[PDB]
Amino acid sequence: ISVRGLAGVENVTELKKNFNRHLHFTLVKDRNVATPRDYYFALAHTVRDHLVGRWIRTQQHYYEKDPKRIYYLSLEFYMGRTLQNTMVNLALENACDEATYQLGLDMEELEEIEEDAGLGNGGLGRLAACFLDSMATLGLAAYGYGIRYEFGIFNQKICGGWQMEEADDWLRYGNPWEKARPEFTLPVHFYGRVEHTSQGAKWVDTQVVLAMPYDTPVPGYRNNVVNTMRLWSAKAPNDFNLKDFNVGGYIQAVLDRNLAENISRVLYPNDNFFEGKELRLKQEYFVVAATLQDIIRRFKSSKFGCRDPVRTNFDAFPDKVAIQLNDTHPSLAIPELMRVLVDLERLDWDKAWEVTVKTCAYTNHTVIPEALERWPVHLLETLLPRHLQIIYEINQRFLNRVAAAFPGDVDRLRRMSLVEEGAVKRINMAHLCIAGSHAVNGVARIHSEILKKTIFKDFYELEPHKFQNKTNGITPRRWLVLCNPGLAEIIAERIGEEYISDLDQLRKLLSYVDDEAFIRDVAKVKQENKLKFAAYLEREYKVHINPNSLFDVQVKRIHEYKRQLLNCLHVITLYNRIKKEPNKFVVPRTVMIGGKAAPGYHMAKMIIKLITAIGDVVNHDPVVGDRLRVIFLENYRVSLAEKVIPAADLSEQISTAGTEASGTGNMKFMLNGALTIGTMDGANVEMAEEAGEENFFIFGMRVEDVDRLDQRGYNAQEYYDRIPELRQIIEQLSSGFFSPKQPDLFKDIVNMLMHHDRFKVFADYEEYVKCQERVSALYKNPREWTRMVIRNIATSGKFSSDRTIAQYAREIWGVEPSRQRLPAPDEKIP
Amino acid sequence: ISVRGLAGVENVTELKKNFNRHLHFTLVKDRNVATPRDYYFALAHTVRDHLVGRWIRTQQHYYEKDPKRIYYLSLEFYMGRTLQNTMVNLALENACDEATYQLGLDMEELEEIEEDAGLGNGGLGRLAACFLDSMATLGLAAYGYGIRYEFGIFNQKICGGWQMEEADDWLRYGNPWEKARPEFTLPVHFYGRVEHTSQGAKWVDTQVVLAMPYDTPVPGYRNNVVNTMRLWSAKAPNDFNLKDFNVGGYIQAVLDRNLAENISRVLYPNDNFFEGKELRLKQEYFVVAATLQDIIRRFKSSKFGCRDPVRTNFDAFPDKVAIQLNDTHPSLAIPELMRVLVDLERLDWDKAWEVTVKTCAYTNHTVIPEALERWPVHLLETLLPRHLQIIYEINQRFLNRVAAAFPGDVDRLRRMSLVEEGAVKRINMAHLCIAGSHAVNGVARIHSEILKKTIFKDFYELEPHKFQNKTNGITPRRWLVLCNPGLAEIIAERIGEEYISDLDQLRKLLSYVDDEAFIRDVAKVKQENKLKFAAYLEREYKVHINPNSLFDVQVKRIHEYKRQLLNCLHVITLYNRIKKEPNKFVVPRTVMIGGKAAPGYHMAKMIIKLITAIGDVVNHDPVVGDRLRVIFLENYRVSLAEKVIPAADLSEQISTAGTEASGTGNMKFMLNGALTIGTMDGANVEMAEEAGEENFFIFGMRVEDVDRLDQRGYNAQEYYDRIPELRQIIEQLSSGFFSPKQPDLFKDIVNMLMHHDRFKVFADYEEYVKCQERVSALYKNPREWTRMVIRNIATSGKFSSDRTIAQYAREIWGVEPSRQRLPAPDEKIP
Ligand SMILES: O=c1[nH]cnc2c1ncn2[C@@H]1O[C@H](COP(=O)(O)O)[C@@H](O)[C@H]1O
Ligand SMILES: O=c1[nH]cnc2c1ncn2[C@@H]1O[C@H](COP(=O)(O)O)[C@@H](O)[C@H]1O
Ligand SMILES: *Cc1c(COP(=O)(O)O)cnc(C)c1O
Ligand SMILES: *Cc1c(COP(=O)(O)O)cnc(C)c1O
Ligand SMILES: CC(=O)N[C@@H]1O[C@H](CO)[C@@H](O)[C@H](O)[C@H]1O
Ligand SMILES: CC(=O)N[C@@H]1O[C@H](CO)[C@@H](O)[C@H](O)[C@H]1O
């Protein structure tokens, strides 16, 4: 059937009865009233059964051996569905497929019922999920720590061409993967004040919110290692949240509990944008405060909570603990670690600081100013008074370090301060993370260099040793084996299976680049994938596309820097050229653009309306025929990505050079047989470098050109004046060609494009369409297109998150990865 | 070990492995980290497994045979713990005791971990729970329908002698008994307006709240019947509760979902008191609207949703459906049934009314005015506009019936109206229920007569056939076999086991009233029970009592009508007499008073403070010694009741004649070997009548005397003037003898007692203490005390809820009870 494992005789039989056990005993249903949803859960529970045994021994193991622990703190974990992924990592896919088949059910139909775990916005959240999978696969004693939002990223609905947001109630029917652990609930404090008494400061008169943990299993790939993702939920104490007496109402007091519990209610839907709301700040401290208590408790036990030197010596803390900051969101972990060590454990400042710096590491994910966290002091002042005092003291000591290093450099001092003066004082969370971490890293080579040259230049001059790079990656399991079994099978037919956990081996595929059978196969799976997607489209969304055309897709969050607008300009151009010479042949294309716009991002929502507007015109022009279709992919999310990416021919990664830190979607397309048209931005550079620039469609300004242009000054009018095709498009938008009933509907987009384009869309237009002509030329030559594809696939190995994690492990955490199978799952009951 | 069933070889082995399965696979724990709470859940899940098989076949059965269905609507279901009760009804107690013993665990210790299902206030809520157990035991196709509050009755804490309320988070660790059924979620409407168009009225522009059901199994006693209790939970739709666009905030919109979900958040802690809050009204319509859709859906299928006359003829509705209104709380079921039939199904008014009256039955539970539901019209007007119109139309037609029956009786017309004029117009829910039901019943013979003679006199003259009586009862399973196995065993030793489901057989115990061994045994179990309670007291609450003294206990909600104050006066008297003649012998007593006071009931909370105040003085007076102890039983609830009642010697049922509808606690004490001192009120009359007034301690005013006194006019001063002992007590309270630091602390109680005692406490004082002297005299004669006890126990049979249900069944519902074992639980998988 494929290498989805063995469909053993004993195990298919075993699976079937357990499926039935659960349907009866767990779901309390009988075959006669069971619906597809019931069947999905019976299966889910049956599969979950297979990893609890391994989950328990893995955790017990780490307790016995006591290795260094890795704590990945992130406010986002974009997990997606977990049924299939679990089957794949446990080698259960074929057995389950067989068993469910014998029970008369279609496994694929059941898999579509699972709701996505959308606890993330986009790239940052998904990176965390791929990292968790890789850390498990590499046998690291790692823990993912986050917030269990009851409402993840909103579900996007397109009404009249506009995006409509609606709550994502992903828990509505329950989550069979998580295990509530109310017995490990911890208290988290807010507000209050600071008392300075005799031997130390005291955080007093605080409001308490309880943090209840929920554990979700994270299975490594076929190694019997099952790590843990612990998500915190907010709960109101039953005392003060009722007991602070003297009139108000008993009923009201109970109803007001949903005020402390609102902390973990919903994820902020912002991607690369900072919103300074108090609720956000509360979520940030909440996950930090609860997680740290968990970290220290585990440390206090270790082998120190037995003997060792005997005396809670936190000197070995950094040898046993490593906490990674996914962006600045969990940045309060630094001052909180200090608070606990100094205030509670009573360590002297300097010893406490040494420990803190040695265990913390920060990962930066963007360079755009509006995405940078700068919290107003009055907020920290009210909500976390002691932390503000600690931050000021950290700043004081740090600046003294700077002054001593650069005597008389008074401007440098204000520039490096963690405290920003002005309208309202703010705290630069990024500066805090650099100062309190022993390593700071970028997510792609150019992004890392930009940090050193630009944004954190002064910090780099002060401590050059801190700055590193760790190019992002993606997991070959979900992003190849899971979403594209067809391609994985033909690859395995030639080079085996060891590449799934050793992607570098894909290079061996280079020697089949001239193999006639392979070329035919690679081309066959892609055709099957396009056919399956073309079907899904009419199935679930309804209104035909042509599977023979080039599948041109750009799927990512809607941003001005991602330039969906630039993609739009090209589409209109294609249309206008066709309308000019109707009877001239052109390579047919289906351009699919999908992504979510943050609810408050007016421009982003305007762009979504433009895309649908273009499709209204283009898709109903008889002269165009089936040569050009414009489709907006609705509710783009992980599960949808697993469907489009394998069916894509052209991947669009066209951000303005220097704005996309790394990107990961690009990698997803490269490993799945799509060719890339893009700018020298983020990881695109390392990808082209790995496949060879001849097998990539690079165009536009490099970072240097962008800067040259900024010195000069960017004037869009120039481009408007010298390019008639471009002029024609702008006047089409301005006159209502794309919005008849509301002719001035797109005035904001035009106005912006002409007068305040921060991402110089016009500057890359000419080279972009020129380049698009080149891909169309190559598509006309199937054999050569496929051979170039083989060149990309065979060379994508470097982009596996196993590589990224292995580097974090060795160069930052100080631990050694291991591909050693944990001693089976085997029963056992001590 | 006892007759807790057989501890079979095969089944104890089977139990043990399943216990282990769950501990591993369900709880995801290993023996080395498992805590008593974990063990409790492993067991709970193991036990729950045994009734899912029976649950499924019972429900399938009713679908096949299609008998008349009984729907018990109540806003309260005081369930308590359910582990032991399930073992008892499934004959699993000894096997589980054995198995857990072999696993090295104490079952009793694990049973104490289960949280109480406190979805009720007191008697009304508990009646519903005993009814459910009886309906299952009598094989009725019955369904309990209510609200799944996430916060039940508050947990009571005594701080400085005062009651402190704190949220009852009973779901904190989960509920292993319920089964969420999100797939059967139904919509419920609120607000909106009424449109009158061409062919009918339309309820429009409403706010929608979703009702998600949760099913809990209700096992009959050893008959393999497992009925269902369906509890509704409020959920916000994800559309409008987000989709009603045009600024407000996306985040705020999601946070505001907890506004529609607040409907099922907390139970109103009022006992026999009406609070006209909008939230309450919403809860009332919510349970009614959701339940009815469920009822009609089931009816539409039946055997009509196949063939029958073919044409949705609701003429057979009353033949297939019976809905019982537990008080007026679910009274909106009447106009709602009309709305659906008329507005949606399009039946003519008269045919719809005929059906409605024929399927609805109302049970009244109190005669005090402040407990009567009278909803302001402006509220119904805003929240349920169409229902108000239907109520006015019902009133219109009803009053026309009255006018035609009593021509010219204009006062009668205003008196019987469902609409009350005055300050603000109100709707008398009780009048609504009488008019729209074919049967109205009281809960005790005297209470029923009072309804006919007083409160509903006019209604009785109009339709005498509607009024009936159904004396309350309690379930012998939980209230004898479960809480008092010792007594059940010795009874079974002589007369067998058939009495558990046929309590009348207890009469056979009359012939052992002179049996020397029996007298010794009955006396032995009571001594063991008192010893076990005396221990629990020091275990969980701490500060000694004497097991040889008479256990004088009064446990029920704190009310002015229950007269805990009268009990207080006696206690102080005992104290004062002892202080007068210290070296005179008196029968030692431990008087235990426990109960919860509604949060807003100032007087009730003042009484709790008085009780503790008396104990502070009495319990620390060296002269008193161990002859008199005053203890306030904290957090009285079902699980605590299962502990005190079996250990009681004297049961206090001293309400003012004519105020306690029936009472049920009294019955609980009678069946467990306690003697009763009380007034001729509620079921006390039928109890004394059943055991013989010679075996009961009756005192005080009868209903007639109370009325005589009211004609005359009640003057407490008279009693104060003629009774020195009484005068002495009042002056002790007035001068601060019981409240040194705050001498005027009890001025409200004294002021009330002397000037506004609605329940004439002083009027029954003399006869009360006189009577108390008689019980003390009899206690001095162990042999005769026990023989009188045997006379009560042997004669309590009539007070089993099986008897009550059998009567409801035959005289109201039109169904025949059956003690036929359902065809085993046996596997099966169609
Ligand atoms: O005190 C202990 N004795 C034995 N095993 C322990 C103990 N504490 C933790 N463990 C094991 O380690 C796992 C880890 O627990 P953690 O503290 O949540 O990381 C537990 O489920 C146990 O298997
Ligand atoms: O359409 C049907 N076919 C077969 N069995 C049914 C059907 N509808 C209800 N049942 C059975 O009756 C039980 C009652 O469902 P209810 O409608 O919630 O009372 C279900 O769990 C099934 O066993
Ligand atoms: C991988 C992924 C992302 C990241 O896309 P980029 O092109 O790097 O912005 C965002 N959303 C989803 C659902 C993804 O799977
Ligand atoms: C039976 C019961 C009641 C009813 O007591 P009465 O004496 O009838 O008022 C109230 N509370 C609990 C917990 C009960 O078990
Ligand atoms: C702040 C933020 O979300 N940054 C995003 O992080 C992901 C994962 O590193 C990058 O691939 C992406 O380019 C970048 O925009
Ligand atoms: C309104 C109300 O709660 N009434 C209560 O109902 C229970 C059960 O019928 C009676 O025993 C009790 O005397 C009465 O006070």
Swiss-Prot record, chains A, B:
One GO cellular component, as annotated: skeletal muscle myofibril
Reactions this protein catalyses: [(1->4)-alpha-D-glucosyl](n) + phosphate = [(1->4)-alpha-D-glucosyl](n-1) + alpha-D-glucose 1-phosphate
PROSITE patterns per record: PHOSPHORYLASE
EC number: 2.4.1.1
Keywords, sorted A to Z: Acetylation, Allosteric enzyme, Carbohydrate metabolism, Glycogen metabolism, Glycosyltransferase, Nucleotide-binding, Phosphoprotein, Pyridoxal phosphate, Transferase
Cofactor(s) the protein needs: pyridoxal 5'-phosphate
Domain of life of the source: Eukaryota
Phosphotyrosine found at: Y191, Y214, Y460
Disulfide-bond pairs as recorded: none
Record GO biological process: glycogen catabolic process
Modifications the protein undergoes after translation, according to the UniProt entry: Phosphorylation of Ser-2 converts phosphorylase B (unphosphorylated) to phosphorylase A.
Residues that, per the record, bind AMP: D30, Y63, R297, R298, F299, K300, S301, S302, K303, F304, G305, C306
Record entry for activity regulation: Allosterically regulated through the non-covalent binding of metabolites, being activated by AMP and inhibited by ATP, ADP, and glucose-6-phosphate. The activity is also controlled by post-translational modifications including phosphorylation.
Classification via SUPFAM superfamilies: UDP-Glycosyltransferase/glycogen phosphorylase
Site feature location: Can be labeled by an AMP analog: Y143
Modified residues (Phosphoserine): S2, S417, S501, S734, S735
Subunit record text: Homodimer. Homotetramer; to form the enzymatically active phosphorylase A.
Protein name, entry field: Glycogen phosphorylase, muscle form
Gene this chain is encoded by: PYGM
